[PDB]
Amino acid sequence: GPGPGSEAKVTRSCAETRQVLGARGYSLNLIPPALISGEHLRVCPQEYTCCSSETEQRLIRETEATFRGLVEDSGSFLVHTLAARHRKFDEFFLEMLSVAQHSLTQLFSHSYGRLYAQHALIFNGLFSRLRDFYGESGEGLDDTLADFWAQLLERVFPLLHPQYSFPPDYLLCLSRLASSTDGSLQPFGDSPRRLRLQITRTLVAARAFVQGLETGRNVVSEALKVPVSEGCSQALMRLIGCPLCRGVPSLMPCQGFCLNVVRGCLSSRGLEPDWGNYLDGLLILADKLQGPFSFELTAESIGVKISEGLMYLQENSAKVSAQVFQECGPPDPVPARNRRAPPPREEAGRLWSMVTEEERPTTAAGTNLHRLVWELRERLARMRGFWARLSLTVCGDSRMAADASLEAAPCWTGAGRGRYLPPVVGGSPAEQVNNPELKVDASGPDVPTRRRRLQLRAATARMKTAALGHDLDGQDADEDASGSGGGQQYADDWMAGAVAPPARPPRPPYPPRRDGSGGKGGGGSARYNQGRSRSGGASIGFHTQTILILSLSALALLGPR
């Protein structure tokens, strides 16, 4: 194949190797000027060499460091963007929570006057619980939304009818009436039904999205904590450092040889098949938050849904009075007057009024929401192939080292030169079992890969279910249904140690695993500890999150006390 021209030089000259590695800070006395009268090579073929064993080991470490730099920088970007998506999403929610709250204060102070002003804490208290629910700390928002209307009927009604006496029996009656006469649509119309349904189902869809982004952030952050195997460091030495130790720095690796080496180095790709399903859960959910579960629309609509209920309260005041002064007790005599009511009192200070509507935010607020869901949708989708791109990037960079040539021309194949022909395996560790250059047994994926793969699926199920507007009190079904899911299994370490008269610290006979371990003390889900297990106990380390708890058994040795 075609390639660049070369200068005639002494065959396998190690002086040239010294020029290349001396620039990297290698001690010059570790590299002879000509091939050493020994082989000294263990990872590279065992032949005469320019590398002392120290030089060979330095190259293994240097190539491993170069490898890690290309993976970690691309991972730091993904972690950074996941944090950026998270922060940007939360800031508009916090903003609209505050903007709606002020606009409601302006709306109700003028439209309802003292009826609102004396009770503003109740209306603003709701907003604090909208935020607490968003953070999963105030999940009892549904009861807060029910109590909101009970408090209003208890406290606004006596101000509408202040001629009547309201002992606590009537006040408590008014608070109960709201729950029984909302069924008849009298004290607030159907507004309580509108308010309670829209807010809760929108917030769980948004909360699921926040939880998903955090799940991804923590999945990727620990995926980079998967160590580089010693087999990878040796395969990387075969990739780059070996022809240099043979005194030929011009030979650089075939892309197909490289891809197999790098794919074997990346066991973290066990996260990949659930990474796609996890991002699909976010993407479907993101589309739902654009309109029917748009929180920014919901936030403003709170004002209208409450104002409608308070208008029904004033309109149906006579109808509510008919219930209050029969169910709570008889009417109070009052100094009612006939003929004509007095004219209303006016104020010397200019009074103002305003009206809110259930319209989506406009101009900058509307376009920021539109851009938010565009940035969330495109950036998440593009990073779906991240785990595959890790393998392609490292070997694309290695191709460009020899950009003046093609693999049609001879390239380095680990132990020699030519064109690489064996196949390149796919992704996940399952395909790395078939890897011809760096074989990896898929039976033992790394701990972050095992634990975080589970988290991706749990998030997937919740986000797709919440996309329907379903509460997050559902299940981890992959059918978006109420069927049960998750569970997993756990094992523990039983230990025994006499408390008295001997004071022996606890030690296992054996940890009873699913199979009972060597002591055969198990039954699948059952775990048994046998033998001289007096003064026994157990240590349980949960596998889904690092949590460790202890227990003890009342089997103290005691002796002939």
Author numbering: 19 to 579
Share the article's original sentences.
To validate the binding epitope of CT3 on GPC2, we conducted negative stain electron microscopy (EM) to visualize the structure of the GPC2:CT3 antibody-binding fragment (Fab) complex. The representative EM images in Figure 3B show that CT3 formed a stable and rigid complex with GPC2. To obtain maps with a higher local resolution, we performed particle subtraction, followed by additional classifications and three-dimensional (3D) refinement. The final 3D reconstruction, with a resolution of 21 Å, showed that CT3 interacts with epitopes from both exons 10 and 3 of GPC2. Surprisingly, CT3 strongly bound not only to the C-terminal region (exon 10) that was used for immunization but also to the recombinant exon 3 fragment of GPC2, which helps to explain the reduced reactivity of CT3 in normal tissues. First, we determined CT3′s binding to each peptide by ELISA; however, no obvious reactivity to any linear peptide was found, indicating that CT3 may recognize a conformational epitope in exon 3. CT3 showed an appreciably stronger binding to the mixture of peptides 10–11 and peptides 14–15 than other combinations. We predicted that the residues 148–162 (LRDFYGESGEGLDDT), which are found in peptides 14 and 15, could contain the CT3′s epitope in exon 3 of GPC2 based on the EM structure. Interestingly, the helix that comprises peptides 10–11 is close to peptide 14, suggesting that the binding of CT3 to exon 3 needs the interaction between these 2 regions. Overall, we demonstrate that CT3 binds, at least in part, to a region of GPC2 encoded by exon 3, a unique sequence predominantly expressed in tumors but undetectable in most healthy tissues.
